[PDB]
Amino acid sequence: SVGIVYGDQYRQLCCSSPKFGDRYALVMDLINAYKLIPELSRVPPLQWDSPSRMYEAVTAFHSTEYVDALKKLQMLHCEEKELTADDELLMDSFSLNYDCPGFPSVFDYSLAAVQGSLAAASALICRHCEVVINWGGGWHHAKRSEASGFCYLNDIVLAIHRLVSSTQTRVLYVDLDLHHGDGVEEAFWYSPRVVTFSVHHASPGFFPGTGTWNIFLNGAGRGRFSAFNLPLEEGINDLDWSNAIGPILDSLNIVIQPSYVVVQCGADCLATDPHRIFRLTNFYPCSLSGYLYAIKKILSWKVPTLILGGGGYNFPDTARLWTRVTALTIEEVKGKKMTISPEIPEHSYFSRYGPDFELDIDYFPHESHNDSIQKHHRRILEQLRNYADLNKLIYDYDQVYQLY
Numbered sequence: 433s434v435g436i437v438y439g440d441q442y443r444q445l446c447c448s449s450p451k452f453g454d455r456y457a458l459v460m461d462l463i464n465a466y467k468l469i470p471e472l473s474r475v476p477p478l479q480w481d482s483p484s485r486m487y488e489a490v491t492a493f494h495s496t497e498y499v500d501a502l503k504k505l506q507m508l509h510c511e512e513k514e515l516t517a518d519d520e521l522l523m524d525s526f527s528l529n530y531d532c533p534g535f536p537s538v539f540d541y542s543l544a545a546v547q548g549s550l551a552a553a554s555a556l557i558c559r560h561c562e563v564v565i566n567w568g569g570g571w572h573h574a575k576r577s578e579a580s581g582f583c584y585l586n587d588i589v590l591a592i593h594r595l596v597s598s599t600q601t602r603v604l605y606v607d608l609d610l611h612h613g614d615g616v617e618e619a620f621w622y623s624p625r626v627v628t629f630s631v632h633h634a635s636p637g638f639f640p641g642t643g644t645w646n647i648f649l650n651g652a653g654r655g656r657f658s659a660f661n662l663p664l665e666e667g668i669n670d671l672d673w674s675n676a677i678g679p680i681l682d683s684l685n686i687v688i689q690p691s692y693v694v695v696q697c698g699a700d701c702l703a704t705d706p707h708r709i710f711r712l713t714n715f716y717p718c719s720l721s722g723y724l725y726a727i728k729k730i731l732s733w734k735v736p737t738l739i740l741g742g743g744g745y746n747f748p749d750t751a752r753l754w755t756r757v758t759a760l761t762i763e764e765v766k767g768k769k770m771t772i773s774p775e776i777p778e779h780s781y782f783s784r785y786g787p788d789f790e791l792d793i794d795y796f797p798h799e800s801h802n803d804s805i806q807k808h809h810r811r812i813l814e815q816l817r818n819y820a821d822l823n824k825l826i827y828d829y830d831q832v833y834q835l836y
């Protein structure tokens with residue numbers, strides 16, 4: 433089946449942060465309003481038998497001292513008194529500040545995404561679902577002992593760790609967010625069994641700064657050549673982004689033959705995101721949403737797949753996109769046509785979709801603002817060949833080369 437992570441408490445926690453407000457509720461209620469929930473298997477977020485078991489799961493990636501500090505940060509924000517200077521310094525040492533501040537549910541909020549993505553991984557491993565969706569996860573920036581980019585715990589790294597440790601198992605990670613998936617790339621820098629691929633904007637001063645010329649670094653030790661990046665200029669439209677990523681995705685699948693795919697589907701590439709860097713849409717025809725193009729291509733491989741959320745700061749338009757991703761996933765997995773009215777159906781959050789209440793985002797596409805892509809394709813092809821040689825994988829050089 434196709435699974436999707438949700439639950440009443442999960443919803444409450446995913447809506448408890450100051451940065452993302454009620455975004456997750458709009459997403460799930462739009463999916464519900466389009467009558468997709470009966471098509472999907474509800475995957476309950478993972479809960480544990482003890483604090484010790486919870487700590488063991490989270491510290492599979494994060495340090496105990498970071499988890500301790502994150503939990504203390506929540507406690508401190510549930511009291512009225514200011515932090516002590518010593519406690520401010522402690523939080524600063526884990527970057528729990530400015531961009532990743534405390535709030536009264538910061539630990540339960542961050543943990544909830546881990547709970548959802550670990551449960552989603554398990555549903556794939558046991559074969560209950562062929563694809564699982566978690567629109568409350570996808571927090572790709574968090575590091576072993578560091579919060580970053582509004583991300584406190586890296587549910588993606590933990591989910592991937594659970595997948596690769598199941599039964600050689602290789603995972604392909606595809607990061608469609610506007611920003612470079614640095615936390616996941618770093619976690620698996622030395623691992624050839626998790627190949628990471630991020631497409632993103634990069635430019636001077638733009639967060640987080642990595643995923644671009646440094647030459648291109650691409651892994652180390654036995655993980656050399658296993659970290660792939662495609663930085664793209666601002667203004668790119670659906671078609672040019674699709675043509676940029678398409679052959680790379682196909683060639684990665686052919687060469688790596690992954691046991692699982694994990695996709696991060698951050699919605700901040702939309703033309704209507706307040707970032708306004710890329711000009712992608714959620715259109716499903718004559719522009720085809722780059723997101724929908726990529727997901728359809730990944731799902732055509734018939735590999736068990738985890739689809740995660742991420743960025744997306746225009747909440748109604750993030751719901752508009754992820755509702756279409758969810759419908760496409762049902763259609764591709766079950767072979768069952770999903771017809772979606774171009775008109776937003778009545779439901780709790782209908783007023784948020786004004787003034788015109790249509791499923792398409794309110795945007796009029798045109799040509800990209802910007803040869804460079806061809807150089808990147810040559811570089812990535814060479815890196816893939818290097819990866820395959822280092823890891824003794826066999827592959828038709830010219831079937832792969834002809835994809836470009």
Ligand SMILES: Cn1cc(CNCC2CCN(c3ncc(C(=O)NO)cn3)CC2)c2ccccc21
Pocket residue numbers: 530531573580581582609610611639698700742743744
């Ligand atoms: C305006 N203003 C600027 C700052 C300093 N930090 C800003 C950067 C902006 C850029 N930034 C950031 N992180 C993640 C994402 C994302 O979507 N990742 O997939 C996007 N953007 C880091 C933080 C700041 C801190 C607190 C309050 C206001 C403040």
Ligand SMILES: [K+]
Pocket residue numbers: 607608609610611612613630631632
């Ligand atoms: K990305």
Ligand SMILES: [K+]
Pocket residue numbers: 620621622623624625626627628651655658659
């Ligand atoms: K890697």
Ligand SMILES: [Zn+2]
Pocket residue numbers: 609610611698700742743744
């Ligand atoms: Zn982002």
